Amino acid sequence: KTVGNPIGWLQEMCMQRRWPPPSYETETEVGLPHERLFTIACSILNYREMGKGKSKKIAKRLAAHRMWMRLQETPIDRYEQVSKDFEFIKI
Amino acid sequence: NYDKPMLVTKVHRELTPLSYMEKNQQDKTYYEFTMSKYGNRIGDVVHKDKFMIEVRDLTEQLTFYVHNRGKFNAKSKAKMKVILIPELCFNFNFPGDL
Amino acid sequence: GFLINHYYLEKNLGYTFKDRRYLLQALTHPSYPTNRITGSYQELEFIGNAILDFLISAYIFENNTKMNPGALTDLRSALVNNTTLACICVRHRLHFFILAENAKLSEIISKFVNFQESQGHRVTNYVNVDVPKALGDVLEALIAAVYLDCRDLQRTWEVIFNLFEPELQEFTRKVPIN
Amino acid sequence: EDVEIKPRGYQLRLVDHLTKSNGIVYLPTGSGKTFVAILVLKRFSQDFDKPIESGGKRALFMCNTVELARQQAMAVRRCTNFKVGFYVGEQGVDDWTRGMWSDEIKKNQVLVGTAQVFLDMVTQTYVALSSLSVVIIDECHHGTGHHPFREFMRLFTIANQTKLPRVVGLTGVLIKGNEITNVATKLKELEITYRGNIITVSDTKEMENVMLYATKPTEVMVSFPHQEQVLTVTRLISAEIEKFYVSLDLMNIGVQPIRRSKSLQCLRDPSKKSFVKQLFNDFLYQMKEYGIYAASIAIISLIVEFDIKRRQAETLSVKLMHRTALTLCEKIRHLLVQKLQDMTYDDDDDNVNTEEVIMNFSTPKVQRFLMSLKVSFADKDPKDICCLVFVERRYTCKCIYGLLLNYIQSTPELRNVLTPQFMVGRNNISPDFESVLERKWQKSAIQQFRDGNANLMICSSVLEEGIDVQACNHVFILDPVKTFNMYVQSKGRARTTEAKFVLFTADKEREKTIQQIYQYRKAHNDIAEYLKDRVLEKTEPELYEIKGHFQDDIDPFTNENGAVLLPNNALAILHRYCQTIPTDAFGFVIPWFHVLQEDERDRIFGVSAKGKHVISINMPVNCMLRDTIYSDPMDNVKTAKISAAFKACKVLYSLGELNERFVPKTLKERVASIADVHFEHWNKYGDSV
Amino acid sequence: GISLPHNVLALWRENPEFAKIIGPHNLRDLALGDEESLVKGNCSDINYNRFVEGCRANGQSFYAGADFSSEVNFCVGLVTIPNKVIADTLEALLGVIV
RNA sequence: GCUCCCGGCGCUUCACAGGCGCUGGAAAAUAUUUUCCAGCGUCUGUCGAGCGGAAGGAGGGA
Q: From 3.30.470.20, 2.170.260.10, 3.60.20.10, 3.60.150.10, which CATH number describes the B1-98 domain?
């Protein structure tokens, strides 16, 4: 549901209001090198939202999205079986 | 998953879905067993109060010269009586005896 | 810095060195990577083999005049055998100072020294456990190191006789024939 | 109404074009591509009989892999009257001397072998490029970067220009990777790497004649749903493997060689532990991808592999580590078997129970694959079906092979139609699930598939390239296609009429895989049209661009004898030399490569090495070099390492350790260099040392 | 009521030098449609040319010199019998006459 | 066992290109809009370098 640039909007809502610019902090880098999961934190005055992503890119983006809509809110046991009606679709 | 053709022997007018299985599944009906096994594949059963059928499997061999000697356990072989809902099985117009 | 328990090794060997780099070359296995100031022991062992063989042959020729030349050459081959050198090296605890970085070689040396301790440092029958050539080669290397440091075949002979006295005495009473 | 095959019009046209001017022939894989090679081989056979000393010449057929070399050697042997030789690293070519190479070339008219063998052949002055009438390159798309084909082509820039051989490139696909965009520059670079332009069939009748041996099989898509939820037993096994990794990180095996990253910034775990970690990670991947039954087969494969490694282990600590790994694998297998057995309450008929548990304990990918396999080979003739299954990972081949064995001996209709078989590339996997010390089965998987004993092949990109396989009606690409050449060549594998090409992709990646296939097809069309409209009178690249293509790398070194030391071969030669120096089993130590720090680099090289990387190499203690040869300041680490190896080899040659051919001196040359001074008196008695 | 296509049969029987190279893998190229298998009676020109070219190319691949008779003999009516069976059937005819 | 080669995938760090978001400065127009410039952060793409798993190939050597 993050259709656009959430952190551009985040900086927008912050420093229209003469609020301090959003600070970004890279907290943890966990996992194997081929599956590293990165943790970016965003702090804006007393509010801080967490960002998890497979890359620092998407982690920071999602952290800023959390900051952004938080700024607005607060002003099996079984593999599923497959049907047999499958066909060979031409490509 | 067993797509082999089979032969229908008799149809049971008195029988109908939602009827209790005669052996080992008295608490299990044909209708609910069919759902619990292939509901995502069949969706639903239509014509629920009509008759059903009884089918028997055909041999897959094509050479009948040598005697098929073995301990078949004929009673155990006949134990698995197969009762099928008609509209869930594809029906040929081909006679079975032929 | 390379030489730890220096006095221990010098006391067991029976020689005190004036120039320690010969000892470093003697104890340097080719697999040891961090020694970049002096070559391995193969050069030293090449000379030491001939020196030890000649000295042993000279002693057995001078003293063992009773036995026939066939027994003399059998005794010579037995005294300079790599197995005998390995037992002598283990008995004097010279394997503690070998500079090597091979896991398989270290395990082989440990197994052989355990087996030797099981026999009480006694030369058994030509020994079911493999014998590493490293012990014999390093022993020959320190022999050549003594020779090069002292430049005196008499002192080298004193060292070799001090090392070989039990084996010399035992092998002069019975000849190991295989 | 005849048996012998006559050359076609397009083949004759290609041969006539090749004889006057060199180039690359781009034809679909099959009999035409090798027939044209045989024809151009025959056309350059004027000077085969005459010896080299009398102005004779030879023909060189250099391949990519040993099996393709043997294959083409047998083909040319059985199709031509020439006598051909087979020269690969398995023949022990390294210890071959001057005289017995000379009689070897004297014997055979055509030399067939791998690229590296002929590269070291030429670089050691065993033959000259003037001594080869024509050279044949098949699978020329491999000749990029530092591949031996490109080094062999680089050798052409040093030898005499007026006495160069004829270069011919055989390929079924021109592009190797995914650089499908901007075809023109890629094709120009490929043509510049060799010394000719690409030629292909143009007339409609020519295309139709080509069509008689190639095929465009129908390609179809088999969608299966993709789900993310996982079983609890998978979580338990993952936790067990994580705990075992924690325990193994402090296993404390004996001292091991230091392993580092490819560019030497970052440290590595010891190779022995990395092997175990790789095996368990591969097993985890297969468990996540194919299902619980697949994990049950893969854990048996891991049991066999760990048992083999423990048997081959030499140290007690290594045996203990492998015993712990085997204990984990047995525990995992027991857990998987327990999970499988908690379904038998459904019925008692085991024949259908096996099929039902297989279909219930596999991901929708495997279930759809099995349904497609059943509906495609329901009740057909085993002699009539011949199909390949392509998967990515090596262990996926074995796992799917075992699962397919069980499924085949689980369903009545597929019981007597399909005989599965599998093979993988180098670092072969044990094809046995019981870890028996020795088996009496000797027929190779590819030989069984060729002979018709097995009709179902599960291969991992091995059969995409090189090996000849009879025309296959069905080709199942179970794993997603990754490269353009893989797609093209797997599509060309289904070479029979009306053949079926099957793609297995999940629902969420349907758009992306359709777009990828569309880009592949459009790349093929641009290749065709670029080869179509382009016209050139010179039809050969000029000298200036050929020189500019190769000047980026380090200039090679040649001595007065003509031997050439290729900088890309310098590291191989140096490691070869460090191999013959030790005189003991435990005396092997490879050179220590060290990357100099900023302060060290400044202190050594002044202000002339800012922004550049330098590599210092420490030769082992035994060797004569103890001067810590320093590489020149280069842009990246790989060039620095190559320069360091090159300087080390040059300084070794100046020291006489290379016998004026940049191959390490053997004992015989060392004693021959001393016979004339120490054994001079032997001559009067008719003997030499 | 069914047999191989007429054209390929004519090529197979009327060419002894060409009959030793047709194998099971070559027969896979003969995938005729409904029209060819039902009304036409023989493979089309393109299919015939492709099959002939594949059979010719058999002589240069790894299949050269192979013996495909054991798997393609039944197509043309040939069969291989041991000489012992021939002697034994002569003796069996003698025995029944006796 | 070691070394090398080819390709693809995933992340990390540098350079370039464009967009966005605004702060400030200069200008025009009627607190408002527009134009130019600087700064910060980001979004999209490209070029380098590095890390990691996976596939294939070769060679030397026992």
A: 2.170.260.10
